[PDB]
Amino acid sequence: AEKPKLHYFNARGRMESTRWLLAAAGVEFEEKFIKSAEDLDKLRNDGYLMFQQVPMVEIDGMKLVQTRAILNYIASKYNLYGKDIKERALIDMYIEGIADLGEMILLLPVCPPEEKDAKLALIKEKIKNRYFPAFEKVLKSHGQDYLVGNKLSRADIHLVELLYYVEELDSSLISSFPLLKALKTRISNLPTVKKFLQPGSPRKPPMDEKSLEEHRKIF
Amino acid sequence: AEKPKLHYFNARGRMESTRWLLAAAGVEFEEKFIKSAEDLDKLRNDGYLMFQQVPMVEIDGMKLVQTRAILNYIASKYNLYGKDIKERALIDMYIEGIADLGEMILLLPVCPPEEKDAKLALIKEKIKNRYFPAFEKVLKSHGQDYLVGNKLSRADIHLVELLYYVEELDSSLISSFPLLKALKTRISNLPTVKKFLQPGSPRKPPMDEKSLEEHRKI
Ligand SMILES: N[C@@H](CCC(=O)N[C@@H](CS)C(=O)NCC(=O)O)C(=O)O
Ligand SMILES: N[C@@H](CCC(=O)N[C@@H](CS)C(=O)NCC(=O)O)C(=O)O
Ligand SMILES: [Cl-]
Ligand SMILES: [Cl-]
Ligand SMILES: [K+]
Ligand SMILES: [K+]
């Protein structure tokens, strides 16, 4: 069984949700870090990046780019995409909500600093009034441990990844959402996930002022 | 038999790719157009919109929001999402590229006016050097009429949609890409797509800064 190989910077960025999903599924993978503009040029010139961009994942004979394509493939392969078309529709709707909020956060430290504090408050309010209530409502309507089909899926994993990111941003945001808190604890305790949250795993740290400025300089 | 209901404004925006897919698949649908802040409030208050946003499509007993979720469901249901996991991976890769370029073009008339010149030039540079070559290469390497599995899929339909948007932007960008021209012709002459492209269909015009700087008030 040939191990998936992830090509990305040694950073969270657009590769983290893939690290989470693979690791939640107990799937062992290798990372090949891109450290120089030469490292990227080499992947490009080898014809390995369909749109000249990373992330790229080598898996089951394919050089897969585009985050959503990579994630969809992994989730079907490891039975984390529900069990039929309608379950997939619910999963997709949830993760796309997650992706909207998460995209706003991914792209917050690269925004204009005079309207960056306007952007931070906008997020915070969407979280409290838009997204966290939407997921709390799903959990409450099923009363089950999982968002869809009463079974672990990518939606649970990605929601919990998101709750970790929202906690780094402000710890009080989840405080009035008891069902989200319990989901985070439950998923964090699954064996694969617990292992991923432990030190020494492929899970990556947040980008700080140092690692961001250096990245832009060399690429 | 029992039609999908699309909830959006009377415009392309984020609902147009859904109109194209449903039309291509042979599926007749209804549109319930949002006209005021008050129609949108009703949708919200009635618990129709999971994240308070449109597009929303009522289909097969569900109330689906999020463009990609809608498209993904329609594509599987009507067998436009390939035959297996590996083909769906190709389709997904291709459609996500299309989406990236398509979003750049969607947001073009909305960027700060002073960035418009630079952004348009970068879009045209991406089209000529990144996107169109990628897709030309796929069609050339297989020698087939369709992008994936020698069979019609959403990737053909959504690429051809994008070739129409790019044509509106600049009709010369496709000129050095003969297999893209030929795919456009072929898909355009499929009866369902031909019908949808005819005058009178649910196909929507380009945004105008009339209906644009006025649909923000919704
Ligand atoms: N839609 C793509 C975006 C990929 C992307 O924006 N990659 C960036 C790095 S995070 C890149 O390789 N930039 C190089 C370039 O566009 O020339 C995805 O989700 O994978
Ligand atoms: N990622 C979502 C975006 C949906 C979206 O941005 N909808 C806009 C109009 S096109 C909206 O309902 N905005 C109202 C709001 O954000 O309060 C999708 O693809 O459906
Ligand atoms: Cl996911
Ligand atoms: Cl599509
Ligand atoms: K689930
Ligand atoms: K195809």
Side-chain angles (χ1 to χ4, degrees):
Chain A
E2 158 77 305
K3 286 162 139 208
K5 324 210 178 323
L6 315 196
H7 301 276
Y8 202 67
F9 315 105
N10 180 186
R12 259 175 200 179
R14 297 191 180 282
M15 195 50 100
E16 202 64 1
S17 65
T18 293
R19 302 192 180 92
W20 270 83
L21 191 59
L22 287 170
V27 175
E28 286 186 294
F29 56 88
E30 312 189 323
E31 300 200 77
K32 180 168 107 206
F33 303 129
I34 291 161
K35 329 221 125 226
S36 44
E38 191 168 6
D39 283 349
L40 188 53
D41 292 342
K42 237 207 122 283
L43 293 169
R44 284 169 173 158
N45 291 165
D46 290 330
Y48 293 154
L49 314 173
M50 181 167 180
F51 304 113
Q52 309 322 325
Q53 293 173 313
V54 292
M56 191 270 282
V57 181
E58 303 176 57
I59 181 166
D60 303 345
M62 293 177 292
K63 313 288 191 266
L64 244 188
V65 296
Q66 289 295 344
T67 304
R68 282 182 179 87
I70 289 160
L71 292 172
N72 296 344
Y73 184 76
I74 290 166
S76 296
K77 195 194 176 159
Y78 299 111
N79 292 344
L80 290 164
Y81 215 160
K83 73 182 161 282
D84 59 43
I85 192 167
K86 280 185 146 55
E87 281 196 359
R88 264 188 334 264
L90 293 178
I91 288 161
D92 281 342
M93 150 158 53
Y94 300 167
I95 75 128
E96 291 293 306
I98 293 165
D100 285 6
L101 171 51
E103 190 90 357
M104 291 165 202
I105 290 159
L106 166 73
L107 294 152
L108 180 53
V110 190
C111 111
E114 41 149 87
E115 288 156 19
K116 184 190 118 146
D117 296 289
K119 219 160 131 198
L120 181 45
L122 185 48
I123 288 177
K124 284 197 187 203
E125 188 266 344
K126 282 179 163 106
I127 289 180
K128 267 212 196 231
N129 290 251
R130 185 157 282 176
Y131 293 106
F132 279 8
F135 293 110
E136 189 85 5
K137 181 173 181 201
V138 172
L139 293 163
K140 171 154 197 261
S141 132
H142 296 290
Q144 289 169 335
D145 287 349
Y146 308 106
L147 284 162
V148 178
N150 194 24
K151 177 150 129 57
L152 185 61
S153 71
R154 67 190 292 196
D156 303 295
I157 296 150
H158 216 157
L159 183 50
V160 169
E161 172 180 9
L162 175 72
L163 303 179
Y164 277 101
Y165 303 150
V166 170
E167 179 167 271
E168 284 167 355
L169 183 68
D170 177 5
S171 286
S172 77
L173 295 180
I174 204 168
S175 76
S176 80
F177 295 106
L179 302 173
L180 293 173
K181 270 224 246 2
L183 179 70
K184 179 179 188 257
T185 298
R186 156 188 331 127
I187 294 305
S188 297
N189 282 329
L190 293 168
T192 50
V193 170
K194 175 137 94 129
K195 190 189 161 55
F196 186 70
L197 296 161
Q198 268 156 15
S201 76
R203 183 173 74 113
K204 297 301 182 269
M207 194 103 65
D208 44 51
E209 289 197 324
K210 296 176 182 182
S211 184
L212 190 59
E213 290 177 71
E214 183 158 38
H215 170 280
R216 286 218 215 70
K217 276 179 202 195
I218 75 204
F219 280 102
Chain B
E2 160 46 34
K3 303 189 200 141
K5 291 175 181 4
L6 326 188
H7 300 261
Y8 203 61
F9 320 104
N10 191 357
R12 279 184 183 160
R14 297 194 175 284
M15 187 57 94
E16 191 74 0
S17 61
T18 291
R19 294 185 190 101
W20 268 85
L21 195 57
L22 281 171
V27 178
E28 250 182 41
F29 57 84
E30 305 179 34
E31 302 195 70
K32 335 294 286 173
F33 290 134
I34 298 167
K35 303 310 219 164
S36 55
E38 298 170 26
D39 311 335
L40 181 63
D41 293 317
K42 163 209 91 252
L43 286 168
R44 286 176 178 172
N45 297 338
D46 283 3
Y48 276 48
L49 310 179
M50 168 170 192
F51 302 114
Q52 300 335 316
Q53 297 171 322
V54 295
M56 187 274 281
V57 170
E58 290 185 77
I59 186 180
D60 298 338
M62 294 184 299
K63 298 176 167 49
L64 291 183
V65 293
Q66 289 292 349
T67 308
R68 294 187 173 79
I70 298 158
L71 292 170
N72 287 0
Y73 179 90
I74 294 163
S76 301
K77 171 167 179 208
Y78 296 102
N79 300 299
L80 293 163
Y81 216 163
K83 196 55 134 37
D84 51 46
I85 187 186
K86 291 207 207 176
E87 286 185 351
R88 167 178 179 154
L90 290 177
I91 288 158
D92 279 334
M93 179 163 64
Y94 303 162
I95 71 196
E96 288 296 313
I98 287 156
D100 289 346
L101 174 53
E103 189 92 346
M104 286 170 206
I105 297 170
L106 177 73
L107 304 172
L108 189 52
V110 151
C111 69
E114 79 275 28
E115 292 164 14
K116 194 157 272 149
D117 280 346
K119 281 198 166 74
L120 170 61
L122 184 54
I123 287 173
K124 293 200 184 170
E125 170 85 13
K126 286 177 185 310
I127 284 165
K128 170 62 182 193
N129 292 309
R130 177 174 292 193
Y131 291 107
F132 276 13
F135 288 117
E136 189 83 353
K137 178 194 222 226
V138 173
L139 296 166
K140 189 210 149 224
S141 88
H142 299 286
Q144 291 175 325
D145 280 350
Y146 302 97
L147 284 163
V148 177
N150 223 175
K151 162 159 191 306
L152 181 71
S153 75
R154 68 186 294 202
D156 310 297
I157 295 152
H158 208 146
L159 176 62
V160 172
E161 177 176 6
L162 176 80
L163 306 177
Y164 281 98
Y165 300 147
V166 170
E167 178 180 32
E168 291 167 356
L169 184 73
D170 182 344
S171 78
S172 78
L173 289 175
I174 206 175
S175 64
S176 81
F177 294 102
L179 304 179
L180 283 178
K181 295 191 255 198
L183 181 63
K184 181 175 190 251
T185 298
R186 252 185 255 121
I187 298 301
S188 291
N189 279 316
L190 289 168
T192 53
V193 180
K194 187 175 188 189
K195 205 228 222 94
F196 179 72
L197 283 165
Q198 269 158 11
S201 65
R203 190 166 63 116
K204 298 299 187 272
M207 66 115 262
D208 40 61
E209 262 175 10
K210 294 223 180 291
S211 100
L212 165 88
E213 288 168 42
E214 253 120 303
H215 284 205
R216 269 177 213 169
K217 305 282 135 279
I218 311 206

